[PDB]
Amino acid sequence: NRCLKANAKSCGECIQAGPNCGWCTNSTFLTSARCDDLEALKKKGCPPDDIENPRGSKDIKKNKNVTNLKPEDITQIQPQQLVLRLRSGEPQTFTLKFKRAEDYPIDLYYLMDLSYSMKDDLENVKSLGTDLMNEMRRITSDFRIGFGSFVEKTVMPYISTTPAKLRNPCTSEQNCTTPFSYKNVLSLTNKGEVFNELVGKQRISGNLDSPEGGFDAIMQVAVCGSLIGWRNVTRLLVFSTDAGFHFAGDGKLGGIVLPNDGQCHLENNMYTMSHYYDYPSIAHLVQKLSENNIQTIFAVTEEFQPVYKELKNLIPKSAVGTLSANSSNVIQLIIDAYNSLSSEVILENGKLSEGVTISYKSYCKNGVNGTGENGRKCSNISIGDEVQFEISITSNKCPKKDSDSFKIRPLGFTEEVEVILQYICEC
Amino acid sequence: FNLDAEAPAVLSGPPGSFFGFSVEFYRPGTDGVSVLVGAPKANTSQPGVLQGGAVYLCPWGAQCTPIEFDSKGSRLLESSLSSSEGEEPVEYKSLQWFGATVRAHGSSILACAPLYSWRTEKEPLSDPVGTCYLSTDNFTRILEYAPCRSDFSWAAGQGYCQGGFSAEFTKTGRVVLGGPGSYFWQGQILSATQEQIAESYYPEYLINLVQGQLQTRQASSIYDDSYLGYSVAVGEFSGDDTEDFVAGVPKGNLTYGYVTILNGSDIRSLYNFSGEQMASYFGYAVAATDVNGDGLDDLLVGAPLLMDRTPDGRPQEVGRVYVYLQHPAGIEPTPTLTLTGHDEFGRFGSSLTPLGDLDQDGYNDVAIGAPFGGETQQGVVFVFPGGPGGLGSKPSQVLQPLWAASHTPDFFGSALRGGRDLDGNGYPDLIVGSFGVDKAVVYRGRPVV
Numbered sequence: 005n006r007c008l009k010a011n012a013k014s015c016g017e018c019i020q021a022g023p024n025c026g027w028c029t030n031s032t033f034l035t036s037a038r039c040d041d042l043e044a045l046k047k048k049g050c051p052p053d054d055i056e057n058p059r060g061s062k063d064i065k066k067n068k069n070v071t072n073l074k075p076e077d078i079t080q081i082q083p084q085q086l087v088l089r090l091r092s093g094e095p096q097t098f099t100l101k102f103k104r105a106e107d108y109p110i111d112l113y114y115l116m117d118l119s120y121s122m123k124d125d126l127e128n129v130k131s132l133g134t135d136l137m138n139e140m141r142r143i144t145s146d147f148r149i150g151f152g153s154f155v156e157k158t159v160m161p162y163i164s165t166t167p168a169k170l171r172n173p174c175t176s177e178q179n180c181t182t183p184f185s186y187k188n189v190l191s192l193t194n195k196g197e198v199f200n201e202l203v204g205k206q207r208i209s210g211n212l213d214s215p216e217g218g219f220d221a222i223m224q225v226a227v228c229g230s231l232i233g234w235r236n237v238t239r240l241l242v243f244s245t246d247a248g249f250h251f252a253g254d255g256k257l258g259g260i261v262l263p264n265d266g267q268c269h270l271e272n273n274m275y276t277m278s279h280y281y282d283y284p285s286i287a288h289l290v291q292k293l294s295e296n297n298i299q300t301i302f303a304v305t306e307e308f309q310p311v312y313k314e315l316k317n318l319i320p321k322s323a324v325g326t327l328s329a330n331s332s333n334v335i336q337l338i339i340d341a342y343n344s345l346s347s348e349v350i351l352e353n354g355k356l357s358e359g360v361t362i363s364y365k366s367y368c369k370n371g372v373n374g375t376g377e378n379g380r381k382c383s384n385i386s387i388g389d390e391v392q393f394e395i396s397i398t399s400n401k402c403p404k405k406d407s408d409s410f411k412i413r414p415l416g417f418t419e420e421v422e423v424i425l426q427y428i429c430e431c
Numbered sequence: 432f433n434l435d436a437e438a439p440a441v442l443s444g445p446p447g448s449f450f451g452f453s454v455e456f457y458r459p460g461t462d463g464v465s466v467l468v469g470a471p472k473a474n475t476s477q478p479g480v481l482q483g484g485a486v487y488l489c490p491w492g493a494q495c496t497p498i499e500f501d502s503k504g505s506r507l508l509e510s511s512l513s514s515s516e517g518e519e520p521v522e523y524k525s526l527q528w529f530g531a532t533v534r535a536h537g538s539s540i541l542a543c544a545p546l547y548s549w550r551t552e553k554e555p556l557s558d559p560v561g562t563c564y565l566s567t568d569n570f571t572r573i574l575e576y577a578p579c580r581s582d583f584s585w586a587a588g589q590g591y592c593q594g595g596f597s598a599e600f601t602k603t604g605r606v607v608l609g610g611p612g613s614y615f616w617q618g619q620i621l622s623a624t625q626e627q628i629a630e631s632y633y634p635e636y637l638i639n640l641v642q643g644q645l646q647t648r649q650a651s652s653i654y655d656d657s658y659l660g661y662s663v664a665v666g667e668f669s670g671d672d673t674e675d676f677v678a679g680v681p682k683g684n685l686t687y688g689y690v691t692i693l694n695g696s697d698i699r700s701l702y703n704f705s706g707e708q709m710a711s712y713f714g715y716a717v718a719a720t721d722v723n724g725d726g727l728d729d730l731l732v733g734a735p736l737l738m739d740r741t742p743d744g745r746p747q748e749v750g751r752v753y754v755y756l757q758h759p760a761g762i763e764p765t766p767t768l769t770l771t772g773h774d775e776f777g778r779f780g781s782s783l784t785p786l787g788d789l790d791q792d793g794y795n796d797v798a799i800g801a802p803f804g805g806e807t808q809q810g811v812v813f814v815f816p817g818g819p820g821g822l823g824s825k826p827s828q829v830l831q832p833l834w835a836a837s838h839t840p841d842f843f844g845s846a847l848r849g850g851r852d853l854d855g856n857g858y859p860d861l862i863v864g865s866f867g868v869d870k871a872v873v874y875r876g877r878p879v880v
């Protein structure tokens with residue numbers, strides 16, 4: 005074994021070398037041979053009152069039961085805080101319960117491509133505010149909607165820069181407004197009528213290359229916080245477009261080399277830095293959408309389904325729907341997407357110290373049990389359903405003498421479990 | 432491991448000029464051995480031209496002076512000289528990023544302005560066709576070469592080509608240009624010999640008339656927005672003595688990206704290599720060099736936005752480089768080796784260069800830039816050793832700026848050029864640009880054993 009082959013010179017070393025090791029201190033043991041298996045020691049005449057064997061532990065510290073109310077007074081995950089003392093190489097496992105709340109508020113921000121092919125769509129979305137509100141009455145008791153528009157970076161080569169085309173990027177007869185990156189038209193409000201009023205006043209625009217600059221807008225919607233109005237509720241971002249998307253690296257064609265900084269840069273409700281920061285990368289959006297608990301609904305036309313479906317596989321808590329040619333079906337699209345998103349829970353953890361590892365096992369409905377990366381998720385979660393996760397943590401070092409802490413939480417939610425780690429390195 | 436990192440030579444250019452955006456070696460012989468540095472936002476003495484961009488000549492010996500490729504301001508539309516009431520320009524040299532690319536071969540220097548645009552002499556456009564200037568015979572003749580300044584205007588044609596966005600010389604001095612915007616950003620590769628360029632150079636006529644020019648063809652609209660020519664390199668991959676064209680196509684194939692190798696004789700497609708993740712920008716950077724001493728050039732491709740996952744489950748942008756070893760019957764589509772960055776948002780694989788054989792052990796080595804790597808995100812350059820089994824998976828050296836971080840990113844490692852011996856000691860040297868702070872750094876190989 006590796007208890008003896010460690011040559012433990014002290015009880016200390018003996019601990020860090022093997023979870024199956026124990027240490028004798030009697031000096032009635034006929035050197036490093038005092039470090040042997042818990043059985044190999046008893047078989048060699050070591051009183052259990054002498055075999056020093058520190059073991060890891062679990063102590064739950066906060067444990068409000070799942071609910072059955074303001075959102076913050078609603079509990080969907082338990083426990084909320086625990087302490088794990090970790091013997092090197094010995095996992096400590098605990099159970100997370102997740103219960104889908106019966107009724108939870110929804111903030112939905114409708115972020116719309118307003119390039120010229122979306123002109124007919126814009127005509128339909130004119131009543132979307134009130135129609136969606138009416139539908140949502142049967143989904144939640146507390147719904148708010150907002151609206152933003154995007155087109156493109158306002159620089160060569162993505163837009164034409166002749167004086168005429170800057171005034172009107174479209175044909176002479178088409179009365180398009182000047183190209184713009186992103187306009188935060190309407191912050192989240194419970195007044196659907198106001199959504200109708202404002203969206204009805206928006207002017208369609210245009211630009212030159214087919215992919216659009218919506219990733220610039222998504223980033224702003226994710227990180228602009230109170231300017232958008234997000235509450236700590238279900239946050240839905242509907243991204244509506246009939247084209248593909250620019251991303252990081254595309255900016256170099258326009259001489260834009262600074263990476264997106266992922267900070268808010270709205271002035272007078274407009275994004276002002278599209279000429280200065282590159283489009284975000286997918287990974288950057290992943291970071292910022294996740295961090296801000298945004299669940300994305302890609303409402304995109306048939307021809308770009310292939311692209312957005314791959315995008316959806318890279319962005320956690322996202323869904324894809326097929327938008328009709330004039331957004332006529334967008335309400336049912338949004339409903340279907342919300343239902344899909346709400347019925348799946350995905351756990352993430354914060355960064356662990358070196359030598360520390362985490363494994364998940366999920367226990368879902370109809371005895372569907374996930375392991376590996378699938379242990380982080382459950383699917384087909386209906387309203388009121390409970391699911392559970394067995395979460396195992398192991399230290400294989402002596403990571404610090406200082407305690408660590410990290411969070412486990414379901415993507416899209418503020419609620420989280422604080423896991424405090426303590427490392428047994430000494431006797 | 433033998434580059435002198437303790438005391439490299441730091442070149443500095445004008446602030447905000449982006450001095451260091453491109454870097455190159457120049458040797459019309461040897462006594463005039465020099466470093467070339469592109470500064471695409473530099474102001475020039477060209478009348479009426481704001482930030483035309485410049486290329487600096489830096490003689491290596493005992494510092495940097497701009498080369499006068501073009502002393503003139505933006506030309507005027509001849510029909511407006513008096514027919515109309517008010518001259519107007521036919522082209523737009525302001526903000527054109529001249530020196531975004533600088534390449535040299537013998538006593539020739541190619542420098543490109545990928546944001547150069549022009550009006551055409553017909554309907555008024557704002558067509559960023561791009562242009563290049565070619566110095567030949569050590570500055571005794573200067574040619575403009577703008578193969579995308581053609582009869583076929585606007586985005587549908589070559590109007591948005593941005594020719595010279597990437598560029599390279601072959602070993603015989605043939606010019607190879609990437610223009611990612613041709614045909615609604617399908618992108619294009621165009622190539623001509625210097626003789627062919629000089630043979631039809633006639634500045635009185637703005638449209639390109641080079642005869643014998645090689646270029647890729649317009650494809651159907653399903654290929655739009657691919658950016659072929661985002662990057663370019665050259666190497667021998669076809670079994671003859673005419674170097675072939677390696678081009679990045681980073682948005683091709685659903686934004687998975689691919690890299691293509693074109694027959695250097697007739698620009699016909701020979702090989703494709705596919706990226707592994709959507710929007711990872713596979714093809715952002717490309718290089719070709721023999722990394723295992725068998726005399727067959729090998730392919731390296733950068734994908735600096737490659738997102739992978741930590742063992743504890745966290746996604747992170749880190750970037751990845753892919754290496755494909757050539758063999759006598761061809762070259763396989765799946766990489767022999769991958770190298771992955773460790774710094775979140777570091778953009779590992781943003782730049783690649785052959786180093787030649789840095790330690791003279793019989794195997795050529797490679798540098799890979801990660802312009803936002805390092806503990807203060809200033810950028811990092813990794814040297815990877817060649818060997819009999821290919822490129823090593825661990826760097827033999829790691830270069831970082833010796834100056835502190837500042838208010839704005841350094842971009843150290845965003846431009847690289849190795850493979851030449853600057854000081855004649857028989858060990859190849861390395862130029863690293865750090866354009867965010869308007870510096871370039873020269874590293875010299877120290878002798879070994």
Ligand SMILES: *[C@@H]1O[C@H](CO)[C@@H](O[C@@H]2O[C@H](CO)[C@@H](O[C@@H]3O[C@H](CO[C@H]4O[C@H](CO)[C@@H](O)[C@H](O[C@H]5O[C@H](CO)[C@@H](O)[C@H](O)[C@@H]5O)[C@@H]4O)[C@@H](O)[C@H](O[C@H]4O[C@H](CO)[C@@H](O)[C@H](O)[C@@H]4O)[C@@H]3O)[C@H](O)[C@H]2NC(C)=O)[C@H](O)[C@H]1NC(C)=O
Pocket residue numbers: 617648649650651652654691700701702703
């Ligand atoms: C690496 O990966 C790249 C990218 O996938 C591959 O490049 C692509 O290869 C395919 C297959 O060869 C190309 O599609 C074909 O294009 C040829 C080119 O035809 C040319 O010559 C014709 C004869 O003179 C001419 O008619 C064509 O002109 C027409 O089309 C252009 C563009 O639409 C238009 O401008 C013209 O007005 C004409 O309308 C053109 O100049 C073509 O002949 C092929 O036709 C076959 O397939 C089509 C569809 O399946 C079918 O309709 C035909 O009947 C015929 O069966 C086909 O269109 C594609 O263009 C390449 N894309 C790019 C960007 O280069 C490459 O092959 C890969 N390399 C390797 C080594 O794997």
Ligand SMILES: *[C@@H]1O[C@H](CO)[C@@H](O[C@@H]2O[C@H](CO)[C@@H](O)[C@H](O)[C@H]2NC(C)=O)[C@H](O)[C@H]1NC(C)=O
Pocket residue numbers: 234235236418
């Ligand atoms: C959403 O919830 C977060 C977390 O509960 C709130 O931010 C916290 O605010 C309290 C007091 O304001 C601080 O003690 C915490 O340190 C904060 N944590 C974080 C991560 O910010 C946030 O204010 C809530 N947002 C809204 C819009 O209500």
Ligand SMILES: *[C@@H]1O[C@H](CO)[C@@H](O[C@@H]2O[C@H](CO)[C@@H](O)[C@H](O)[C@H]2NC(C)=O)[C@H](O)[C@H]1NC(C)=O
Pocket residue numbers: 367371372373
């Ligand atoms: C998934 O795991 C669950 C564990 O909870 C399994 O269901 C339990 O099975 C045991 C015996 O097999 C019973 O004693 C429990 O009553 C079951 N629990 C419930 C809630 O029914 C389930 O069989 C596993 N399924 C698969 C496919 O492995």
Ligand SMILES: *[C@@H]1O[C@H](CO)[C@@H](O[C@@H]2O[C@H](CO)[C@@H](O)[C@H](O)[C@H]2NC(C)=O)[C@H](O)[C@H]1NC(C)=O
Pocket residue numbers: 445446447448472473474481482
């Ligand atoms: C190139 O020269 C122009 C003009 O002198 C510089 O632009 C000026 O910069 C100052 C300070 O930023 C401003 O107050 C002026 O309004 C600018 N003038 C114009 C016409 O833009 C520019 O900064 C110089 N660029 C470099 C790289 O040196």
Ligand SMILES: *[C@@H]1O[C@H](CO)[C@@H](O[C@@H]2O[C@H](CO)[C@@H](O)[C@H](O)[C@H]2NC(C)=O)[C@H](O)[C@H]1NC(C)=O
Pocket residue numbers: 669670694695696697701
């Ligand atoms: C690269 O292109 C050259 C030129 O098209 C090819 O060489 C030609 O090969 C054909 C055979 O199909 C001969 O009939 C011609 O005489 C050759 N021309 C020249 C100029 O050499 C060459 O085969 C191509 N290489 C590959 C690997 O396809």
Ligand SMILES: *[C@@H]1O[C@H](CO)[C@@H](O)[C@H](O)[C@H]1NC(C)=O
Pocket residue numbers: 128330331332
């Ligand atoms: C969408 O366009 C079609 C055109 O055929 C039209 O019939 C339909 O009414 C439009 N959608 C809505 C919701 O009006």
Ligand SMILES: *[C@@H]1O[C@H](CO)[C@@H](O)[C@H](O)[C@H]1NC(C)=O
Pocket residue numbers: 369370384
């Ligand atoms: C979800 O679970 C229910 C059982 O409550 C089952 O009837 C249904 O088929 C499941 N749906 C899917 C998509 O697995």
Ligand SMILES: *[C@@H]1O[C@H](CO)[C@@H](O)[C@H](O)[C@H]1NC(C)=O
Pocket residue numbers: 459460463569570
């Ligand atoms: C090349 O030109 C430079 C001046 O720019 C000069 O100093 C150098 O001697 C010349 N070299 C040759 C070989 O003519």
Ligand SMILES: *[C@@H]1O[C@H](CO)[C@@H](O)[C@H](O)[C@H]1NC(C)=O
Pocket residue numbers: 684687688689703704705706
């Ligand atoms: C295109 O992408 C698909 C899926 O990523 C891949 O299987 C295929 O090999 C790629 N083809 C080319 C020519 O890049």
Ligand SMILES: [Ca+2]
Pocket residue numbers: 121122123124125246329330331
């Ligand atoms: Ca439409």
Ligand SMILES: [Ca+2]
Pocket residue numbers: 155156162211212213214215216217
């Ligand atoms: Ca666009």
Ligand SMILES: [Ca+2]
Pocket residue numbers: 667668669670671672673674675694695696
């Ligand atoms: Ca060849």
Ligand SMILES: [Ca+2]
Pocket residue numbers: 720721722723724725726727728729756757
């Ligand atoms: Ca080789």
Ligand SMILES: [Ca+2]
Pocket residue numbers: 787788789790791792793794795796816817
């Ligand atoms: Ca070597």
Ligand SMILES: [Ca+2]
Pocket residue numbers: 852853854855856857858859860875876
């Ligand atoms: Ca040297």
Ligand SMILES: [Mg+2]
Pocket residue numbers: 119120121214216247
């Ligand atoms: Mg559009």
